[PDB]
């Protein structure tokens, strides 16, 4: 179907879910979260596509 994202194995719903649930980002629409809300244990600090 092409339900992957972000040039890796992760999916369009799971990435939308992790972006919303860490940052409120996933509606209107994906971008890099600000460094004060991107803490050390946060998603986008640590997500590594390969």
């Amino acid at each position: 179907e092409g339900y992957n994202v972000a040039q890796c194995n992760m999916t369009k719903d799971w990435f939308l879910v992790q972006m919303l649930s860490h940052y409120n980002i996933g509606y209107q629409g994906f971008h890099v979260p600000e460094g004060y809300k991107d803490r050390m244990y946060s998603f986008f600090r640590n997500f590594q596509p390969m």
Binding site: S21, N24, N46, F47
Partner: protein
């Protein structure tokens, strides 16, 4: 690579080390407030859920 490059399979994966995965119990997956909306819709039950 080069003129004599071999026919090849493409592999894709991710890593996401220091994180711990999350799924908010909120109707749209957003942190609208720490006591979520769904945690207030589901307050009352006849047979409180399994």
């Amino acid at each position: 690579i080069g003129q004599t490059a071999v026919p090849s399979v493409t592999q894709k994966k991710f890593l996401c080390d220091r994180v711990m995965w999350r799924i908010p119990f909120s109707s749209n997956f957003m942190s609208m407030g720490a006591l979520t909306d769904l945690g207030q819709n589901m307050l009352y039950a006849n047979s409180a859920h399994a």
